[PDB]
Amino acid sequence: MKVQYSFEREFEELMSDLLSKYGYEMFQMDGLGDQLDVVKFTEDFVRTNISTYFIEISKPHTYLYSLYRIWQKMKEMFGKGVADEFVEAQINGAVYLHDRHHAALMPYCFAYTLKPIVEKGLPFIKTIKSEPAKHLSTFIQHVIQFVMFASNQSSGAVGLPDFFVWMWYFVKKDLKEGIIPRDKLDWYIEQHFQILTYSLNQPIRTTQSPYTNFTYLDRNYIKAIFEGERYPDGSLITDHVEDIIALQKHYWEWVSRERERQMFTFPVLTASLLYKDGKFLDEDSARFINKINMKWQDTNWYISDSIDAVASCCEKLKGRMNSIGGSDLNIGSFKVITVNLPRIALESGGDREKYLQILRHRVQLIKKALAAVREIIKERISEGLLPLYENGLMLLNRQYGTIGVTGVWESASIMGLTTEDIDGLKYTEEGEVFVDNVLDTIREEAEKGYHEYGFTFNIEQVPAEKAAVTLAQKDRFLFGEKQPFEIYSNQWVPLMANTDVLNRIRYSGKWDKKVSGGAILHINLKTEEESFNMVKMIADMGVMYFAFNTKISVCEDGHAFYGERCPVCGKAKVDEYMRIVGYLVPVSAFNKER
Amino acid sequence: MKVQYSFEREFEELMSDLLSKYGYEMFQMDGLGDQLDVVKFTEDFVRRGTNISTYFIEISKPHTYLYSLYRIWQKMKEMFGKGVADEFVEAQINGAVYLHDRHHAALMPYCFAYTLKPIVEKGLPFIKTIKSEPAKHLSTFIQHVIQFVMFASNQSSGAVGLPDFFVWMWYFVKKDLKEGIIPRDKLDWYIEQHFQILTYSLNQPIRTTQSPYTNFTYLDRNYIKAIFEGERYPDGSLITDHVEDIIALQKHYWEWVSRERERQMFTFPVLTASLLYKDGKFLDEDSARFINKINMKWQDTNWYISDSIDAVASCEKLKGRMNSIGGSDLNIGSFKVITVNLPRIALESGGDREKYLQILRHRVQLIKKALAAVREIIKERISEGLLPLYENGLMLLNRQYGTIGVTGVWESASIMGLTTEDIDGLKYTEEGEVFVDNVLDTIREEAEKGYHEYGFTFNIEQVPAEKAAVTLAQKDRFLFGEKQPFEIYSNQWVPLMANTDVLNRIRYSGKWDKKVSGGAILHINLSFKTEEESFNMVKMIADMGVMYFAFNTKISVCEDGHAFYGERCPVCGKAKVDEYMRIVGYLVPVSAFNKERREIE
Ligand SMILES: Nc1ncnc2c1ncn2[C@H]1C[C@H](O)[C@@H](COP(=O)(O)OP(=O)(O)OP(=O)(O)O)O1
Ligand SMILES: Nc1ncnc2c1ncn2[C@H]1C[C@H](O)[C@@H](COP(=O)(O)OP(=O)(O)OP(=O)(O)O)O1
Ligand SMILES: Nc1ccn([C@@H]2O[C@H](COP(=O)(O)OP(=O)(O)OP(=O)(O)O)[C@@H](O)[C@H]2O)c(=O)n1
Ligand SMILES: Nc1ccn([C@@H]2O[C@H](COP(=O)(O)OP(=O)(O)OP(=O)(O)O)[C@@H](O)[C@H]2O)c(=O)n1
Ligand SMILES: [Mg+2]
Ligand SMILES: [Mg+2]
Ligand SMILES: [Zn+2]
Ligand SMILES: [Zn+2]
């Protein structure tokens, strides 16, 4: 049976024109082939439970609408030619539209402050309304309901950096009023840690749990952010730095302790530390994080050289944006659109000058697309469909349009700008300059964007959990043996590359700053003092976001351990946890997705 | 653009035939017209002002219905041949029958009333994102109940029943109190605070588009004793040793609910009190008088009346009350409801009552085959691993009815010319009452045969039909026009808004509730003069044989959701802006019902 989609002839012609050129396998690769056939899709899915079915079924169709809607908007704003060009690039694999099934419907991610939740409660829930919390139990509960609300109003992370700032207030209150058995205060704190953590690891996005971030704010950051800001009882938040610190430390100690019982992913843990002139200003917090990380290495290191971007937080945008974790308070991105660099290399045929003209062009096309998507978001807001915006929780003016990049290594390899020696794989000198030029080119267009389109752009070397595959596929499909790589890399140097770590650190030191920390370095791995030194060295080199990776075994009951046998129940290892794309995940789910 | 779906050409030919015989308008009414066009659907949704999270659930419903329709057609063809398969598809699309939750029909089952026993004894091993050990505290127990409701409510189409909630909650209240986890001087707070955490969670949009549908049951002493006979708590103690404890906690919730509404109104959980009643008296009179008293305020509780506990003792033909609104016995559910359009048969019969009854038996027998097919599809999904509720022994297939729904009884008889009026208002004629006796008995016979026929037990229910009551009258009015003067069909033996003496309503429910085995409801719009007067009236109704009933008040609410009576909020002083009313058996915002009803006119 045939089903009609009321597309403009111009679109249907375009789609037709592309289908004839690229063929069906390309549309199949883009998820617009057999996946649009409900009967085929369903009996295919028949091979996670049924609640997943209803989320997965509509994605090809909502993608196809969003593609169409963005095409329409881009044509309105920049003419048919530009609109057609984006669609072709999206389908052929020149660019990767992220969360494309959502792209013309809701935004991507934002790091929230819980302040307005503490102060207004939950008025934006329409099925029922909640007053502001008066107890630790309710406060925790409000966060849970908020993450449920927010994680289905957006595609990406829900960041909760200042969570522990507000939690302490309700610890003090319930302690004041004698709700806690003081003979068991640590159990009480750790119970609310447990209840929150386990809830955030429930399939609240149906197909999976929400993506959430916690931040250990160091003493310097707590001071800068909440300078002058008061608690609901009128007291000053800054007066309780040490109180807020110990609560944070408590959680990190507890989670390290909890993993043996049950291994979990979320929240993603980052420690934000200020570091100047070869030293941590909050050295106490620094040595603490380094110590807790010794067990699982489950906290990412965020390093910054100033706190100016976060002063008195609570038109050009400043503040670190990172998809994995570490994003500053009240910073996000409404959408990412990535540039396939290996594609540009294959197109350039070696001509670095043509590459940089092709690159500069595609970045500008992306900027136009981001500007179109942003217009759609604003439509959806006015249409009453995005209450996160209307209740002042998600802030559009505080969301970047993000220009993504991936496959940096593979691109330079295709250009023939990599090599190997006693220290392993590396870039040639021309290669490093080429990277400087690529990143400099994109930086130029990002800055021009602000004056061009009225909002701030940023740049990120994205995790590319899926794009790293479907792009190498589309390029393989369109260039064959010329594209030898099975997947593209999400770091300056590939994770599984035989190379001295000192080179990895240097490249990150060179280029992390160019993307404003919009990247991550993590190395697969023996003393505490030895470990802490390594951290300082990496920080000296200028690396802005990094972590160390361990192989965490698990059994079918969820016990965390190292080895082949569980030291809890004796059940053998069955799966592994590892930081593959920035956060700790089961390898089995990762490989099966790929 | 054009999109292909891989149907057997036999099905495609069938759909082709039906379209030519009924026209595109028929498919539009069935939700298989413009609704399947994503661009049309989206731009339509985009200017329907609920937020963007709703879009992704509503978008696929026409498509998933189409698949489910196609899958049932296939299975029905495999079990009973193409004629029966074609006969069913035609009957669904034209409106002879109503497939409930049709967008889920080939994917997941309908409803069930669970016991939290396995949750208590095993925790949450079936959640895949993370695993929880058996609870050890009140806080975790509550939090487990919540994860269970989220789990179950998105793997079924209908109600998540929690009859024995207060039985199990109490044990953890006692555990945390003993071990100094709960401060004694704040014993009542910790209890009402977790009443509040659970209840508010249950009114969160956990099903995205809406909150879950949940039920609570006040089990009276007789029911507690019967159900948990010989059953022990985790500490080893007998549950029947703590009947009084369980009762008191239950009373605390009802007292609390009635206390909590003025602060914030809410629908869920839907409240029912199950009471044993024989020979003109309540066997647990203390519980009955309590419920009678508490209800004086909001009338927010439904009365469930039974005359024996034989059907729930120590909890292959299935017995146990199944009711969609609430009151469903522990470990009872339905895997699917398919309703028969009775006014349709009236229109076909032309008045010939013998002809009517022939058509009815046929369509019931057609419905039974459909239920049997769906049940086979469910079993397929289970084995395919898509329905863990079964694998973990929470949802029980053997304990699930196949349901032959009914609707439009009044309107049907009216068309037959078997209704009238007198000094005490609208009522059935003598032959009309006989006719209704024949209709229900006929269906009942076939249901009973179904067990021997199809291997599982069948039940009957005059369903709420919040939507079906509209779309069927629409289709009938489209196919018969002037012959069908009703805008909607009724979900009670006598229409709620029909001027009739209440005693007539009670009589008819007394007569016919037992035929559907309490598979119905009776609610009367109201003030009483005394508590004792109300209690007498409850006993009168219970004498008459009514099995499920309630009284209705018009609960005002302001913009912040405070519950009150009148035009001014006693809490904030803000004016009334909306009402709450039991329209189909549970309390809802009238503005929500009216518009949801309007979005299908
Ligand atoms: N699970 C939940 N989800 C959302 N809101 C909730 C939940 N539980 C409680 N609430 C709401 C109810 C209240 O409007 C609000 C604050 O409740 P709470 O902090 O317990 O104060 P309260 O109004 O209950 O007074 P108290 O509990 O001190 O008697 O939170
Ligand atoms: N919000 C939640 N959702 C799901 N599971 C949870 C939640 N909070 C805690 N759990 C899990 C964690 C445990 O595996 C299990 C039992 O927790 P609980 O009853 O608090 O005892 P416990 O194992 O934490 O011992 P204790 O609390 O006495 O240290 O429930
Ligand atoms: N289970 C996940 C994984 C990732 N993310 C979000 O997506 C980001 C990384 O996405 P990426 O892997 O780059 O996206 P792809 O999978 O390549 O593409 P798509 O947009 O289709 O997911 C994370 O930082 C996070 O904010 C998420 O919400 N949930
Ligand atoms: N918001 C609601 C309303 C009802 N129900 C379930 O559906 C039953 C009543 O459904 P009914 O009104 O008979 O179905 P319709 O809405 O007419 O048809 P459909 O199956 O298409 O919903 C209730 O008892 C309840 O178990 C539900 O899960 N959620
Ligand atoms: Mg605990
Ligand atoms: Mg409270
Ligand atoms: Zn184990
Ligand atoms: Zn009010």
Numbering used by the authors:
A (entry chain A): 1 to 47, 64 to 330, 350 to 560, 565 to 633
B (entry chain B): 1 to 49, 64 to 329, 350 to 560, 563 to 637
Q: What does the original paper state about this entry?
A:
Ribonucleotide reductases (RNRs) are highly important enzymes for all life, as they are solely responsible for the first committed step in the synthesis of the deoxyribonucleoside triphosphate (dNTP) building blocks of DNA. Here we present the crystal structure of a second class III RNR from Thermotoga maritima (tmNrdD), which, as purified and crystallized, surprisingly does not display such a cysteine, possessing an isoleucine (Ile) in its place. Nevertheless tmNrdD binds a substrate and its allosteric effector in productive conformations as expected from previous structures of RNRs of all three classes, and it is enzymatically active.
The structure of tmNrdD has also been determined in complex with the allosteric substrate specificity effector dATP and its cognate substrate CTP, as well as with dATP alone. The electron density is very well defined for all parts of the CTP nucleotide. As in the other classes, the α and β phosphate groups of the substrate are held in place by several H-bonding interactions to the N-terminus of a conserved α-helix (499–514). With the ribose positioned as described, Ile359 at the tip of the finger loop is positioned in between the radical-bearing residue Gly621 and the substrate; however it does not reveal an obvious pathway for transfer of the radical (see Discussion). Furthermore the crystal structure of the dATP/CTP complex shows that the SIGG motif is compatible with substrate binding.
